[PDB]
Amino acid sequence: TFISRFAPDQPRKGADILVEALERQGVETVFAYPGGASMEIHQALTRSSSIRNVLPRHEQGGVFAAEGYARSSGKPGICIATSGPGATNLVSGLADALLDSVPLVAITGQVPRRMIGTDAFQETPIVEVTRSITKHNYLVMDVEDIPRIIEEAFFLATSGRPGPVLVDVPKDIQQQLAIPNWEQAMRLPGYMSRMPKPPEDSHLEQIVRLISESKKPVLYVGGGCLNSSDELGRFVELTGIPVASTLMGLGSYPCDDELSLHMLGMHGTVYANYAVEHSDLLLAFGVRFDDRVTGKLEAFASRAKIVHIDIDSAEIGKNKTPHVSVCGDVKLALQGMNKVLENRAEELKLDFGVWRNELNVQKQKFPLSFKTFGEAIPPQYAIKVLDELTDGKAIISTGVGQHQMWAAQFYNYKKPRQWLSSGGLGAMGFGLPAAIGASVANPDAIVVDIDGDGSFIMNVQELATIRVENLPVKVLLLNNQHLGMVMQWEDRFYKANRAHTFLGDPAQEDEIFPNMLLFAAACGIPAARVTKKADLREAIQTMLDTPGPYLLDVICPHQEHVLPMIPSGGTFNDVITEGDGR
Amino acid sequence: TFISRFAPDQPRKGADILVEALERQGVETVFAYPGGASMEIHQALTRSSSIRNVLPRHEQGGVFAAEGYARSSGKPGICIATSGPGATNLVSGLADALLDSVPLVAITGQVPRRMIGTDAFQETPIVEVTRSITKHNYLVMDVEDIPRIIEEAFFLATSGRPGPVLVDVPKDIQQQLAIPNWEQAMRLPGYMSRMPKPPEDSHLEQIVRLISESKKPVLYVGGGCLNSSDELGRFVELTGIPVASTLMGLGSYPCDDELSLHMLGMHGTVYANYAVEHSDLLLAFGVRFDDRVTGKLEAFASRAKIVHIDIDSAEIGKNKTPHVSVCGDVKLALQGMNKVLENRAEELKLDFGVWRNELNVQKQKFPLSFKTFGEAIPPQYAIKVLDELTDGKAIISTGVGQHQMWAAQFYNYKKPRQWLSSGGLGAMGFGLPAAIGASVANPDAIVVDIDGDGSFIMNVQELATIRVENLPVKVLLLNNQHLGMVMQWEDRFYKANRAHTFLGDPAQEDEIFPNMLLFAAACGIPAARVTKKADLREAIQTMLDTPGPYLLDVICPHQEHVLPMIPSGGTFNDVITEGDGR
């Protein structure tokens, strides 16, 4: 089926074998930045006709772009870097992909094998450095292993709990000629023996039993449900259970639905956190009970039976002890429970109307809100407008901070893989590169990077990439001249004592600095600024309608605070529902 | 002597103790970027009146700035970052400082101790990740240890072979109140017992003996002599031995001297490599026999007695076996040998005229050269002009690549700590941030970042820092629209097959992309472009004369090749003396 480019008997460079290994894996896009130790790989790349390379302007841009690609497609993201500084520049991206369980394969060039450990030119023990921040990694010591290792890396990166896998390839092995064997079996006995088996009916039935026995059930959906959109939807219509979501889970279930409690956690809706606080049954599907969501574990869902379905046994009972657990694919568990619910429908007659109403009162007494001052643009409102003009069908990538929280709160994601945000590590500068990868993976989609002025500038150099690659990336920059999230904490806990959180120029306190429009101009990307709420709708519309890349610099008052807010390690009773930096 | 800010009996936050620990170390500048896990530290920082913080726009910018500070002052560079992504963003900087032996202390915030290892919000096992890329690191587990650890870190970072030391500080320890004990003794028994003792006279005399017994002596000076400028100078005038230098050693001995053979190695002068190839005595002072300099070890200084003086015993005999070694401070060894040479002067009567002439013929037959095409600006010439107009008294930081090599070849450094360049790791994007640190450390000096278009854009966001901090940083951008060094290798070894090395826009092949002038404009930094060699001198003069930050975009023909060049693992007989990409 697969048509190679070399005679089955003809030897080729290890680099060429590495590339075919990728083509055989179905790879079409890679984000690679050339360097000495990886020249061979880049040369082999130009010989390929099925793989396109998107040359970033910084290796970190490459990884984040690969993450965006993966997060938006469900496919693994592939980035390539040279040795030493090339490799080290991927570090934040690997840690990010590992904490968020993003399928990713990173390939780094290395100095020749005999040069390893000798403090050679541009060498860093990347395998040692990245061991604790990757799902697994390798150091190829023989051209003969390229096929097997590449296959193993992709398998590991995509199976079970997705994650990053780094493959270190010495330069001498890239140049070595050999005849590849694509038949080699993978050496993953332990891992493959540990892969969860499909859920047992006895287990799934005890859950449906608990559901029928409950009066206040609540779904706690997370990043693990990204591929179970349909299964989850069907499940909710057969049980009528309200759905609360983590930041990683946004989109698994449409935020624009009466059964939707939206996001829970530190900055979750009052009603979402309320439902969990007063639920008797908590269905934790594809979540990892993070401190951001639980606060004080003792108080979290303190009065309810917890069911936890996860693909990683290491997560079940890590922070919260379930009453019922299922180690396996949530997508399968849902399909199974759906059948049962579908059959015993009549004898079940599930009705959680009273619960939903008890919640709908909370959803009405404590809905998400934002104040509007004069003609100042409310960031929340801008996002709300973006949602409207894009009909909630846009892929949104973001930076980290207040804007990120608002992008999560005030936009309704119809489906998963529409929300691309760094949640676990919370790395700034993720938004722009992520958008690049998402756009390449989704050429027809509307890709909007809702960024912050602090996050945007960190990888601003990727604007060059966007232009040269001609990607229709739209940038909705919520410029507030500060490191918002941190200044909010300065206001709440440090008597508003500013400590290096102002990003503008002290010499011209009232001048917007820097002038993001000029960064755009430098890379030939049309841009415009907005300051009055009145002409914001027209502005955003322009950005959307203008073909190609576009930067809309939206000026916002910095005293805005993300609400509501449950302080760290707090309880639902510590939730802050009002205030700002005024 | 030291006046604190807290009553000796009054307890203060661990964060405040950490800051005083810095003040007590003599720290005046730190490059810190605020984050959740480090808020306390930033707050404590604002209470300090002796320490100023330079807020970068990216943690990588912070480290590189700290490196520039250190490299240009001889003082340790201090950078601070928050946990998770903050910490991971320092990685390339730590690896860089370790490979180049740059004194640096990095402080990173961490999640609360009880949260460690739980996959907490923004946590990364930074100590584990950085163990192989730092001289040493710590995880503070008790506020009581702040004083001792900080003292130990600075001691380790600055003593012996300088290097980076990272201190991980959990957030709960930053908030804990305590009364510091500044009297605690350091726990470095092993290290301190291993510190080299001053050189023995017997050893130093055997060297002076070898010198008198030689006919073709050659000094091989490196980064280890940065603090022995005077001792080295005196030594050379007492022996009259020609001085070859590594890229790290530039400036230890004035490049503008008849006894100077300039740089040796891969891109070293033909005469410098010649002298080493035909020397009978090689005086390796403060060097680590890197592959860049030696090529094929067997052939390197194959016909001569090698004397190696290093402060790190692990380096003596690592790649080349000396005939005589001295493990200690080269500065002391020079002072000792100077006395001997000064006394036995008459009975010695050292005269290496014949050798120097044999070399001066090579220096004349094979001098550094560059061709000039029409009115196209020769990068070499631009640097030569910069040297002239600044009277070789400017501090030069650079990126990595061809421009870096030219900045090394065509500028005469009068003293050490004038040349700030990433040599071991060779990390791109180093030039601009390094200049920031150098300028802060040297407010009166002329600081010029000779960058490449590829390297410059990686950390272009630091332009905002330069403006806001009002630093007179001059940027001599040698724009060639490509990743020069890599394209040169494409030309020599890959039939000029371009593989992702073009940095401009393929849609407008002839248009300079991006427009670096606009990046400058965005951060309110005056800038101008130059294309004709005729008005280059006036341009550079303007840049220098214009008060404050300035960006001069110098357009160069990309077919330029750095010469001469000894291919990797090659011999002096493989030296390439001509050719380009035309």
Added chain:
Amino acid sequence: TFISRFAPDQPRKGADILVEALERQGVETVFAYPGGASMEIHQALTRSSSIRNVLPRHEQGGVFAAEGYARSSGKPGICIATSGPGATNLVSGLADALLDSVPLVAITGQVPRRMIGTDAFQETPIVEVTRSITKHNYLVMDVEDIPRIIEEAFFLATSGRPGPVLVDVPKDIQQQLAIPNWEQAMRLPGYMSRMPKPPEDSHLEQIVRLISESKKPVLYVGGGCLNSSDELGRFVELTGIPVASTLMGLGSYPCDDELSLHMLGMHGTVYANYAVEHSDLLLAFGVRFDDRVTGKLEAFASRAKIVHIDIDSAEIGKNKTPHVSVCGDVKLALQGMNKVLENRAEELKLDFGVWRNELNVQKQKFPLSFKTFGEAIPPQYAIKVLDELTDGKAIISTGVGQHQMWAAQFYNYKKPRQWLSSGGLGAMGFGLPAAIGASVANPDAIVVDIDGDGSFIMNVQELATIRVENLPVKVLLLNNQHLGMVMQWEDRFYKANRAHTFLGDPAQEDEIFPNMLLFAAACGIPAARVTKKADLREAIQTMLDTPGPYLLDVICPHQEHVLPMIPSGGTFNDVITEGDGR
């Protein structure tokens, strides 16, 4: 040349491949103790007709036996153990072989690959546990790798600085059928590129030059000269330089020679340490400047030029900085220097008579001595008698402690590999098992284990092995009822305050306990006790003349102290020349 036992096309069990891998390496003897995880290997072993297995009674016995085999033959020692407790029981042996640089290959069975890391029955992470105590180790993950790994292990264990290498073999791989490929190339690029090249003449000549320039030269020979007996002898007759030896070097040069200064160090002869203290030239051949020999480094050979020839660059300049070093095989360096010395003989006319005499006076004023009390047997005397009756042609293995020191002091080894003693780790219980291995490796030699009552009892179970294997092992047990070496230190530094150092029974203080004769009897080994010095000579003679295994229990007064003695970290001026525990 090699005749297998399976058709080149016929697949066999991995276990069978492992065994042929050994046969192909020239292995004839292995010391293996069967266990669950290694049954397959033992079965494959019985199919072999060239390899004999010596079943010990404890895995520790197996390793020590393998060490004895290696130490006495120059061949690598092979031991095999099962997983878990089998493997952990080898630990002391591996550490021992690593510290003494003894070529050894240890093979351990492991649980099936899929069971690894699951806390399986009898599984221990042996590769992780032994990483810091072996030269290198492996975990076989594919039957296909057996040939390559075994070849690599033997190569690594025997080349450069000899050491132990452990190969962990999962049980499922032992059972897997496959067709071995004995043509596979080893993957040791780094190591093989680092292997020292033969010494350069320039280097060797500078040494001969130093020798002619010296007046008080002293040879400091160690374990590295074990294979240079002849080269060393010739060297000494061409230079007439006195030879001092480390405990590991005994035998490299005949102790019974006027040019012999015998052992130096803590318990070295006064004259040996004197010569080093007052030498102007120290020729350190195959030594590692251990604290036992140097004491206070500053004072060690403080007034002399140090030449250090070692096969491990990591050792050159580790504790002492040489004035001249040579990283390579001492055997080759000697052959080279011998030629030079042989030619420039006349023009050299080396004469160190004055030095030798200055020493011969010391050798006469401070010779090794021992007092004789009534009819009590002096341990020193017993060993002296053993030497006489065996004509110094016996292979001597020992335990650790006073007897060990006396066995070193009062016996003249004619050749190397006659002295088998644990020097670096100094592990008790080594003597008996080591003798077993030595006897198997040297069926015709006289093998005598000079043991202590404390050391002997630790692995007394190996007596069963000696009997069943019918090995002519003689045991000269110097029974002093105490842990001698420790009690000596109690006397000198703790006011003779006994702290658990008495090995007899407090209930019968005057009764010899235990009765070692009965341990012998239990394993059917003839034994006899001696208490009177008068009938000691006849006793030892009997032991020697009685065919087969024999145990001679020699009772000695415990107040004996090993002398002379230079306290730890002391100087030659701190040498203790008299005293005991009376």
